Amino acid sequence: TLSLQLPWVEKYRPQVLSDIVGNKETIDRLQQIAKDGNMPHMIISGMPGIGKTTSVHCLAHELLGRSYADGVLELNASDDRGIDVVRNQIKHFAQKKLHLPPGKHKIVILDEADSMTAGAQQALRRTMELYSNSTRFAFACNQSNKIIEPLQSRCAILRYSKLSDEDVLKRLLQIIKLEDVKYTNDGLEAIIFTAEGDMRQAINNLQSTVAGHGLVNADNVFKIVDSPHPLIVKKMLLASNLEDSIQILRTDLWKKGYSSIDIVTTSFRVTKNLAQVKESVRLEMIKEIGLTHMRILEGVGTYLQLASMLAKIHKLNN
Amino acid sequence: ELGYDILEQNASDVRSKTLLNAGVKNALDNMSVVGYFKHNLNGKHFVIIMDEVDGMSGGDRGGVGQLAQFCRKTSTPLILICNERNLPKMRPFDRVCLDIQFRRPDANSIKSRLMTIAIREKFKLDPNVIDRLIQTTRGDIRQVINLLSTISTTTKTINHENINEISKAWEKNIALKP
Amino acid sequence: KRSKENLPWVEKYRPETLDEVYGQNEVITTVRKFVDEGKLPHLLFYGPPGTGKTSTIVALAREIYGKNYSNMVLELNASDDRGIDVVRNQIKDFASTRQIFSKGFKLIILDEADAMTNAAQNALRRVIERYTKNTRFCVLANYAHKLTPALLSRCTRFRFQPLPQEAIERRIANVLVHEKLKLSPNAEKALIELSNGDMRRVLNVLQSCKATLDNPDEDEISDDVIYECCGAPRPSDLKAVLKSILEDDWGTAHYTLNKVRSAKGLALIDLIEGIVKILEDYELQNEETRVHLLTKLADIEYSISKGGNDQIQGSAVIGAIKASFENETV
Amino acid sequence: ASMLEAKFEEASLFKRIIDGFKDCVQLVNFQCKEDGIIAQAVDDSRVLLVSLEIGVEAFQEYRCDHPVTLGMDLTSLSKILRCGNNTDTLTLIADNTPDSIILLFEDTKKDRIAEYSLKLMDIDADFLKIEELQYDSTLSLPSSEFSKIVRDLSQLSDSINIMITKETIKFVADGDIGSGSVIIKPFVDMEHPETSIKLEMDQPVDLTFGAKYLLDIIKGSSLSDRVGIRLSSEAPALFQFDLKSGFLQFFLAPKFND
Amino acid sequence: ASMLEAKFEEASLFKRIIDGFKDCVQLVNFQCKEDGIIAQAVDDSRVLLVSLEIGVEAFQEYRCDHPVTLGMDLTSLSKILRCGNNTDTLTLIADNTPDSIILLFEDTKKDRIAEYSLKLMDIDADFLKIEELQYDSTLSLPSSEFSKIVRDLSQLSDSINIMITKETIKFVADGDIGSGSVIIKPFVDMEHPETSIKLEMDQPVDLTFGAKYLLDIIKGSSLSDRVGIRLSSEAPALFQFDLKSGFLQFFLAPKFN
DNA sequence: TTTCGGGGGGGCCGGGGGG
DNA sequence: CCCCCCGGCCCCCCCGGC
Ligand SMILES: Nc1ncnc2c1ncn2[C@@H]1O[C@H](COP(=O)(O)OP(=O)(O)OP(O)(O)=S)[C@@H](O)[C@H]1O
Ligand SMILES: Nc1ncnc2c1ncn2[C@@H]1O[C@H](COP(=O)(O)OP(=O)(O)OP(O)(O)=S)[C@@H](O)[C@H]1O
Ligand SMILES: [Mg+2]
Ligand SMILES: [Mg+2]
């Protein structure tokens, strides 16, 4: 078959600010800005798949209307964004003459701005300062720390928070109603649990489950979406007896095809984020895990090394 | 104020060694045509402002050393602006220019300005929380004004009720020094 | 390249259709259903070496486009340049343009994407998003930690498990039929055991075994042939060595280890692995015995990986096992 | 040096043919048979297909006992070709099951001989027969005019949109700094037939193409003074340049309408 | 597409005029009135001023209801202009409150029309008033000679010194590698007046200028066969190239003594 | 400080085209 | 025959985890 079905992430991508879930206060602020205009330079930061690009595009559309094509300059990591681009194309766009209503400005949308080089960011400073009367800049990024301090000083900070399970369930229910998808409460709970606050991941998993099995229930959802291995690693590290930890390692991780490097890196991360355990114990476990990680990187990526790491961790915990 | 003609350069312009030699180098000892056609006794002389001097990258082709050499024979006033004076790139400027430090302004010096802005924009600001806002911005006045502009769009009263949330949301995460 | 009979068995038996991929029934069924109704999403295939990921994606492309699939897909791997410039120009142009031959959608196969740079992966995000209406992406990986979370967020994940024993048996039967070979049940069991779920190992060992037989037509591949060609210890040798270590005194254990190793020139690392596998099933009253065994044997394995004195390493193995098992009394 | 032996009276012809598409593709499989030489290649992006055909009449002497496939790299072939002069005859020589191809430049008047050898490469790119397609529009125009239009419009934007409607051909580009539009109409002159603009229309068409691909395609204007463009809504655009005993064809896929 | 309609019967003239001062200024404000078109621009270094004037006699059909100001990025304008031939007529069309202007290249013999749109720029540069001044030295010489002298001298140093004394013109360059000099005297030939070097000196003059600015100025030599240099004691030098119904002027500020 | 590899930006050099 | 535009090496400078 040479035909494609449009992904539901694109088909049901919000087109207005009112269709975005989560971060209610920021969405209301953006709605007020759209109503009144005078949009300032802004930096929107947050975790993947929470509606940052969607928010920026919706704000630009509501602000500009018919003028969107002329008054919006969009650049992302897939386009050329070197110092020359900033110095020529962005400057030309900023200096461009464009008659707009008495409360609107041209918009430059720099998506994934955290990937831009230091030189381009430095060149953007006086460009933003001088042409603010007619042009405004909207950065979208995952890590606001990558944006240099002078640019942060020039922009309004908007830190997006993770989506609660309630909002994900609400959006999934809207999509299900619009698509007439047969489902069960347990299946939706499994999808939400596996998504971990990633709306895009949740929608993709729902669409894949519907396509592959039809009915959205726990069995089909877990068949399509594998249980995250970090939870398995956490269970392995928290086991009371060495035999149980070895059992988990051999059955749920090693026999499923997970590589030793992945297992050791996930163990390091989980141990780092193990608040239930005393910090000094966590540091000793990290020392052992690092020894094992160095051994694996050298080339000895065997099940015996991971078993020895588990044995040392249990000896420390005892 | 002193009736000079300003020739400003910044990071948005090419300031390599070749461009510097073929650019502002000729302006060190050159009369300003605008000054002549706008006739103060100093209006015919340039004041070369090199802003964002730390924004140029390059050990030798960047032109930092070339700017340092220019600083030793300029026939007109030359003012350089940078954010990090102690960076290795700034070594050529060790003992060739008069160094002037601009410290983070205290809350009192800007409380009057903040109150003026608050009343003019017709939103209420509590003077007892202003210092906290400064602590949020680490003395960045532009950031403080931006914070007020963005918050006032929906919340027309600023006081101890919501000071904590506003400060936490807009906290400036600056990388610490060694 | 005069004929397909000149190719190594690992490549001469490469599946050409989705019906020739074994041990991945769930993934094959799901992808077949996706393609049948035109609901193919962006795909990720994560799995260990030699499980059938490249074979599966190539078979899927051939099924979608037919024999002339190479000209209608953009395939990139670790042997080709995949920098940020490549993503910006070549991948973008392929994704944004129509097919030359047909009017169908376009497929981009990023094999071994775990070797891609972070900048290229980041650049791929909006490329995947913008052109999803007419283009689909497939990613293949052995190590998931090398893939950025943004890329993983946009793909549907399929895990290729280590090949089950039944699938290996069926493929061995097909290969035996094609090659006109005979294999004993014990030889098949040993081959499956040493495979560790990798088909390439099975095929290479089978080719070596065929090369070993004096008369490949009349002769049958026995477990002895497999052990000789692979130069691996027999289960009886491992059992004897372990029994001597556990029961006999130091002199007798040393003599037995040396004699067993010198009989067929076995490697110490293979003996250590076999003994570890045997001891895994042992029921130990004290966990400290298991702790000592694992730690000391892992240390010895790491030391062997860098060379060193072989006799001292063997004595170390003997002493480690004896000391660890001394903790089962009190 | 007997299996395949082909002769070009002037080496400039083969050099110009190679330069016509050397910037589009890098690896090409030349198939030589008793009826002449053919070649088909696809660029790395898989957006452009180049198809070259050279008949026997283009050669002073041509002999090919059995069909032979020769895989070559374009830059190496061009580097070897540029050695020869414009007054020297060229000879391509290949043996049975060859691992290399020999290029011989001869200058009888000066008794000058120059031999070069190029190692062949194994390319598993089978010749894909391009089934003939009926096109909505077929327009033949001077090569220089098309090259000028492409070079002018490519500066404004990275995409060029071609519209064919009743007695009119329009080339449009829209970019950051502005837009450009060129309108041409059919016109025939008996005094200067080489400058005529010929258009045959069945259905109107409107297709967008990448500017870089058109810039590469126009490099074949040297081979022929006229270019024929065949356009259909359901088929890729075909740009053909006619040689004395052959042709060079570029099949370019249009951009997705979205 | 009604207010401003300005026609050049060859597109080559406008392209040449733009190329005359393209390398010294980037953003230019073209003010078009009933009388004609004027443009005043200041280079980045703020030491060179370019003044272009084009009269209505230079247009096949010029019409402008009310004065209009157009912001031009010379790079984009030149890129647009290079798409047209000399034999074709070039028409500039500008409407009310224009965000862009239209350039139309038309071929009379053929039926080919090329329409381009150029986006205008927001330029807030102030306009400087140039009052007439009585220079103490005024010379006229062939443009090719001045261009050759400037190019030869610029190869040595970044500064050129010009001395005007009784029936003597001197151009000197002093650099690190070496120095060079060139001396000319007024001369007039009736058979070839176009090479007649003329000088009118009221008082002796001596002024230094930058090499890059002179190299930019001489790029307009193609516009006019002759070039006029006016120098005063302590005022910028004026380099003039005359057009059929217009002029191009470069006011260059000298280096302080 | 720095043991590869990738990315970016700037400087010349030289082929080709135009006058 | 000489000058200018513009593609390609050559070099040098800077991250490298999440
Ligand atoms: N708050 C949301 N409400 C509704 N849909 C959402 C929301 N967030 C994400 N989605 C859905 O997921 C798709 C992608 O959302 P995006 O805006 O691209 O997330 P993102 O944070 O910009 O991703 P990154 O940071 O570039 S990895 C949208 O088209 C929506 O269909
Ligand atoms: N499921 C399978 N069924 C049949 N043969 C297989 C299978 N998997 C692997 N093989 C055989 O081993 C060879 C290699 O298979 P591949 O598809 O290349 O494995 P792979 O997972 O892509 O290896 P990596 O991840 O690049 S190390 C095939 O040509 C087959 O001959
Ligand atoms: Mg995004
Ligand atoms: Mg593979």
mmCIF file of N, CA, C and O in Angstrom, chain D residues 63-119:
data_model
loop_
_atom_site.group_PDB
_atom_site.id
_atom_site.type_symbol
_atom_site.label_atom_id
_atom_site.label_comp_id
_atom_site.label_asym_id
_atom_site.label_seq_id
_atom_site.Cartn_x
_atom_site.Cartn_y
_atom_site.Cartn_z
ATOM 1 N N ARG D 63 33.107 -0.701 -32.201
ATOM 2 C CA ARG D 63 33.015 -2.153 -32.193
ATOM 3 C C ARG D 63 32.799 -2.626 -30.764
ATOM 4 O O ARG D 63 33.563 -2.264 -29.865
ATOM 5 N N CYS D 64 31.758 -3.432 -30.563
ATOM 6 C CA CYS D 64 31.447 -4.007 -29.253
ATOM 7 C C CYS D 64 30.966 -5.435 -29.490
ATOM 8 O O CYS D 64 29.830 -5.650 -29.922
ATOM 9 N N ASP D 65 31.834 -6.408 -29.200
ATOM 10 C CA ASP D 65 31.509 -7.803 -29.485
ATOM 11 C C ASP D 65 30.292 -8.260 -28.688
ATOM 12 O O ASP D 65 29.347 -8.828 -29.248
ATOM 13 N N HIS D 66 30.298 -8.024 -27.383
ATOM 14 C CA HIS D 66 29.210 -8.416 -26.502
ATOM 15 C C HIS D 66 28.911 -7.269 -25.552
ATOM 16 O O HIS D 66 29.774 -6.421 -25.304
ATOM 17 N N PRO D 67 27.699 -7.218 -24.999
ATOM 18 C CA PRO D 67 27.370 -6.134 -24.065
ATOM 19 C C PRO D 67 28.340 -6.110 -22.894
ATOM 20 O O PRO D 67 28.725 -7.153 -22.363
ATOM 21 N N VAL D 68 28.737 -4.904 -22.494
ATOM 22 C CA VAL D 68 29.693 -4.728 -21.407
ATOM 23 C C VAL D 68 29.221 -3.588 -20.517
ATOM 24 O O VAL D 68 28.818 -2.530 -21.012
ATOM 25 N N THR D 69 29.275 -3.801 -19.205
ATOM 26 C CA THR D 69 28.926 -2.787 -18.220
ATOM 27 C C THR D 69 30.198 -2.289 -17.550
ATOM 28 O O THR D 69 31.043 -3.090 -17.140
ATOM 29 N N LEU D 70 30.330 -0.968 -17.445
ATOM 30 C CA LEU D 70 31.507 -0.333 -16.867
ATOM 31 C C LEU D 70 31.051 0.670 -15.820
ATOM 32 O O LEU D 70 30.375 1.649 -16.150
ATOM 33 N N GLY D 71 31.412 0.424 -14.561
ATOM 34 C CA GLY D 71 31.098 1.347 -13.487
ATOM 35 C C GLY D 71 32.223 2.346 -13.305
ATOM 36 O O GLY D 71 33.383 1.964 -13.140
ATOM 37 N N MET D 72 31.873 3.631 -13.336
ATOM 38 C CA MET D 72 32.853 4.704 -13.302
ATOM 39 C C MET D 72 32.437 5.766 -12.296
ATOM 40 O O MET D 72 31.254 5.938 -11.983
ATOM 41 N N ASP D 73 33.443 6.481 -11.799
ATOM 42 C CA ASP D 73 33.252 7.642 -10.943
ATOM 43 C C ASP D 73 33.446 8.896 -11.787
ATOM 44 O O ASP D 73 34.438 9.014 -12.514
ATOM 45 N N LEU D 74 32.497 9.829 -11.684
ATOM 46 C CA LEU D 74 32.456 10.952 -12.619
ATOM 47 C C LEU D 74 33.673 11.857 -12.487
ATOM 48 O O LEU D 74 34.247 12.275 -13.499
ATOM 49 N N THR D 75 34.075 12.198 -11.259
ATOM 50 C CA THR D 75 35.164 13.158 -11.106
ATOM 51 C C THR D 75 36.470 12.603 -11.664
ATOM 52 O O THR D 75 37.234 13.331 -12.308
ATOM 53 N N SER D 76 36.731 11.311 -11.457
ATOM 54 C CA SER D 76 37.937 10.703 -12.012
ATOM 55 C C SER D 76 37.903 10.709 -13.535
ATOM 56 O O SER D 76 38.908 11.019 -14.190
ATOM 57 N N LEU D 77 36.752 10.368 -14.118
ATOM 58 C CA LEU D 77 36.635 10.356 -15.571
ATOM 59 C C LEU D 77 36.842 11.749 -16.149
ATOM 60 O O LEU D 77 37.529 11.912 -17.162
ATOM 61 N N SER D 78 36.260 12.769 -15.516
ATOM 62 C CA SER D 78 36.443 14.138 -15.991
ATOM 63 C C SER D 78 37.894 14.584 -15.846
ATOM 64 O O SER D 78 38.431 15.275 -16.724
ATOM 65 N N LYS D 79 38.542 14.206 -14.740
ATOM 66 C CA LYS D 79 39.944 14.559 -14.548
ATOM 67 C C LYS D 79 40.817 13.937 -15.628
ATOM 68 O O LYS D 79 41.749 14.575 -16.127
ATOM 69 N N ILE D 80 40.543 12.683 -15.990
ATOM 70 C CA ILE D 80 41.294 12.061 -17.077
ATOM 71 C C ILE D 80 40.979 12.745 -18.403
ATOM 72 O O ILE D 80 41.877 12.994 -19.216
ATOM 73 N N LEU D 81 39.705 13.062 -18.642
ATOM 74 C CA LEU D 81 39.305 13.611 -19.932
ATOM 75 C C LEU D 81 39.925 14.979 -20.180
ATOM 76 O O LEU D 81 40.324 15.288 -21.309
ATOM 77 N N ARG D 82 40.014 15.817 -19.145
ATOM 78 C CA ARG D 82 40.515 17.170 -19.364
ATOM 79 C C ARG D 82 41.984 17.199 -19.762
ATOM 80 O O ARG D 82 42.469 18.253 -20.189
ATOM 81 N N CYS D 83 42.704 16.081 -19.637
ATOM 82 C CA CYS D 83 44.093 16.048 -20.081
ATOM 83 C C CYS D 83 44.196 16.243 -21.590
ATOM 84 O O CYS D 83 45.069 16.975 -22.071
ATOM 85 N N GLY D 84 43.314 15.600 -22.350
ATOM 86 C CA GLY D 84 43.418 15.638 -23.793
ATOM 87 C C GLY D 84 43.148 17.016 -24.366
ATOM 88 O O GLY D 84 42.493 17.865 -23.761
ATOM 89 N N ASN D 85 43.672 17.232 -25.568
ATOM 90 C CA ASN D 85 43.486 18.481 -26.287
ATOM 91 C C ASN D 85 42.247 18.405 -27.177
ATOM 92 O O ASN D 85 41.618 17.356 -27.327
ATOM 93 N N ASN D 86 41.899 19.546 -27.772
ATOM 94 C CA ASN D 86 40.739 19.623 -28.649
ATOM 95 C C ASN D 86 41.019 19.116 -30.058
ATOM 96 O O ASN D 86 40.069 18.859 -30.804
ATOM 97 N N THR D 87 42.287 18.963 -30.437
ATOM 98 C CA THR D 87 42.661 18.507 -31.768
ATOM 99 C C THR D 87 43.092 17.047 -31.791
ATOM 100 O O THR D 87 43.635 16.587 -32.800
ATOM 101 N N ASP D 88 42.863 16.308 -30.708
ATOM 102 C CA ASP D 88 43.267 14.914 -30.600
ATOM 103 C C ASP D 88 42.038 14.014 -30.591
ATOM 104 O O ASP D 88 41.030 14.331 -29.952
ATOM 105 N N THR D 89 42.129 12.896 -31.303
ATOM 106 C CA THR D 89 41.044 11.923 -31.321
ATOM 107 C C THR D 89 41.094 11.061 -30.065
ATOM 108 O O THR D 89 42.167 10.775 -29.527
ATOM 109 N N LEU D 90 39.917 10.646 -29.601
ATOM 110 C CA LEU D 90 39.798 9.867 -28.376
ATOM 111 C C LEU D 90 39.386 8.441 -28.710
ATOM 112 O O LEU D 90 38.621 8.212 -29.648
ATOM 113 N N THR D 91 39.905 7.483 -27.947
ATOM 114 C CA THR D 91 39.558 6.078 -28.131
ATOM 115 C C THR D 91 39.320 5.450 -26.768
ATOM 116 O O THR D 91 40.196 5.494 -25.900
ATOM 117 N N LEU D 92 38.138 4.873 -26.586
ATOM 118 C CA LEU D 92 37.798 4.115 -25.391
ATOM 119 C C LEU D 92 37.976 2.632 -25.685
ATOM 120 O O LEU D 92 37.415 2.116 -26.659
ATOM 121 N N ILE D 93 38.758 1.956 -24.846
ATOM 122 C CA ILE D 93 39.130 0.564 -25.056
ATOM 123 C C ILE D 93 38.832 -0.223 -23.787
ATOM 124 O O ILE D 93 39.116 0.238 -22.674
ATOM 125 N N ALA D 94 38.255 -1.410 -23.961
ATOM 126 C CA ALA D 94 37.984 -2.301 -22.842
ATOM 127 C C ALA D 94 38.131 -3.744 -23.300
ATOM 128 O O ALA D 94 37.820 -4.083 -24.444
ATOM 129 N N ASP D 95 38.604 -4.588 -22.387
ATOM 130 C CA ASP D 95 38.807 -6.004 -22.645
ATOM 131 C C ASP D 95 37.670 -6.812 -22.024
ATOM 132 O O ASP D 95 36.790 -6.280 -21.345
ATOM 133 N N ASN D 96 37.696 -8.121 -22.260
ATOM 134 C CA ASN D 96 36.686 -9.002 -21.688
ATOM 135 C C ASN D 96 36.803 -9.024 -20.169
ATOM 136 O O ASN D 96 37.903 -9.095 -19.616
ATOM 137 N N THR D 97 35.657 -8.969 -19.496
ATOM 138 C CA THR D 97 35.594 -8.933 -18.040
ATOM 139 C C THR D 97 36.606 -7.926 -17.488
ATOM 140 O O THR D 97 37.449 -8.275 -16.657
ATOM 141 N N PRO D 98 36.545 -6.673 -17.930
ATOM 142 C CA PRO D 98 37.610 -5.726 -17.595
ATOM 143 C C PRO D 98 37.556 -5.286 -16.141
ATOM 144 O O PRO D 98 36.496 -5.252 -15.512
ATOM 145 N N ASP D 99 38.730 -4.950 -15.611
ATOM 146 C CA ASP D 99 38.846 -4.257 -14.338
ATOM 147 C C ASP D 99 39.164 -2.780 -14.516
ATOM 148 O O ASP D 99 39.234 -2.048 -13.525
ATOM 149 N N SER D 100 39.355 -2.330 -15.755
ATOM 150 C CA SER D 100 39.681 -0.939 -16.030
ATOM 151 C C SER D 100 39.318 -0.627 -17.474
ATOM 152 O O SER D 100 39.105 -1.528 -18.290
ATOM 153 N N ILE D 101 39.252 0.666 -17.773
ATOM 154 C CA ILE D 101 38.989 1.165 -19.116
ATOM 155 C C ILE D 101 40.146 2.065 -19.527
ATOM 156 O O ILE D 101 40.662 2.836 -18.710
ATOM 157 N N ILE D 102 40.548 1.967 -20.792
ATOM 158 C CA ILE D 102 41.683 2.713 -21.323
ATOM 159 C C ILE D 102 41.156 3.846 -22.193
ATOM 160 O O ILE D 102 40.297 3.630 -23.055
ATOM 161 N N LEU D 103 41.667 5.051 -21.958
ATOM 162 C CA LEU D 103 41.390 6.214 -22.790
ATOM 163 C C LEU D 103 42.678 6.605 -23.503
ATOM 164 O O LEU D 103 43.697 6.872 -22.855
ATOM 165 N N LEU D 104 42.628 6.640 -24.833
ATOM 166 C CA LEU D 104 43.791 6.922 -25.665
ATOM 167 C C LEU D 104 43.538 8.199 -26.449
ATOM 168 O O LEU D 104 42.571 8.281 -27.212
ATOM 169 N N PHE D 105 44.403 9.191 -26.262
ATOM 170 C CA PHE D 105 44.364 10.429 -27.025
ATOM 171 C C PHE D 105 45.459 10.387 -28.080
ATOM 172 O O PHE D 105 46.635 10.175 -27.756
ATOM 173 N N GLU D 106 45.067 10.588 -29.337
ATOM 174 C CA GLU D 106 45.964 10.475 -30.476
ATOM 175 C C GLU D 106 46.029 11.800 -31.221
ATOM 176 O O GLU D 106 45.007 12.468 -31.413
ATOM 177 N N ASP D 107 47.239 12.174 -31.637
ATOM 178 C CA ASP D 107 47.482 13.354 -32.468
ATOM 179 C C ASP D 107 48.411 12.902 -33.593
ATOM 180 O O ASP D 107 49.635 12.904 -33.440
ATOM 181 N N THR D 108 47.818 12.508 -34.722
ATOM 182 C CA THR D 108 48.607 11.959 -35.822
ATOM 183 C C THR D 108 49.574 12.994 -36.383
ATOM 184 O O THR D 108 50.721 12.667 -36.711
ATOM 185 N N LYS D 109 49.133 14.247 -36.504
ATOM 186 C CA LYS D 109 49.986 15.271 -37.101
ATOM 187 C C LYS D 109 51.267 15.459 -36.298
ATOM 188 O O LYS D 109 52.354 15.592 -36.873
ATOM 189 N N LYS D 110 51.163 15.469 -34.970
ATOM 190 C CA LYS D 110 52.324 15.576 -34.097
ATOM 191 C C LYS D 110 52.823 14.225 -33.606
ATOM 192 O O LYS D 110 53.814 14.176 -32.870
ATOM 193 N N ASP D 111 52.171 13.128 -33.994
ATOM 194 C CA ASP D 111 52.562 11.792 -33.549
ATOM 195 C C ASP D 111 52.614 11.720 -32.025
ATOM 196 O O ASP D 111 53.558 11.186 -31.437
ATOM 197 N N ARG D 112 51.587 12.264 -31.380
ATOM 198 C CA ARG D 112 51.504 12.312 -29.927
ATOM 199 C C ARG D 112 50.500 11.275 -29.439
ATOM 200 O O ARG D 112 49.374 11.209 -29.943
ATOM 201 N N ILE D 113 50.911 10.471 -28.462
ATOM 202 C CA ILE D 113 50.077 9.418 -27.895
ATOM 203 C C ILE D 113 50.006 9.628 -26.390
ATOM 204 O O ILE D 113 51.039 9.816 -25.739
ATOM 205 N N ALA D 114 48.793 9.598 -25.839
ATOM 206 C CA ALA D 114 48.589 9.721 -24.399
ATOM 207 C C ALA D 114 47.627 8.635 -23.943
ATOM 208 O O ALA D 114 46.467 8.618 -24.360
ATOM 209 N N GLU D 115 48.104 7.738 -23.086
ATOM 210 C CA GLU D 115 47.316 6.617 -22.592
ATOM 211 C C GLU D 115 46.981 6.833 -21.123
ATOM 212 O O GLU D 115 47.859 7.184 -20.328
ATOM 213 N N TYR D 116 45.715 6.623 -20.768
ATOM 214 C CA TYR D 116 45.266 6.703 -19.386
ATOM 215 C C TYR D 116 44.409 5.487 -19.069
ATOM 216 O O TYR D 116 43.709 4.962 -19.937
ATOM 217 N N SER D 117 44.475 5.038 -17.818
ATOM 218 C CA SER D 117 43.718 3.881 -17.361
ATOM 219 C C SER D 117 42.880 4.283 -16.157
ATOM 220 O O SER D 117 43.377 4.962 -15.253
ATOM 221 N N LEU D 118 41.615 3.870 -16.148
ATOM 222 C CA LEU D 118 40.697 4.163 -15.054
ATOM 223 C C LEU D 118 40.144 2.853 -14.516
ATOM 224 O O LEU D 118 39.531 2.084 -15.263
ATOM 225 N N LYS D 119 40.360 2.603 -13.226
ATOM 226 C CA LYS D 119 39.851 1.389 -12.602
ATOM 227 C C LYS D 119 38.331 1.438 -12.501
ATOM 228 O O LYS D 119 37.746 2.473 -12.174
#
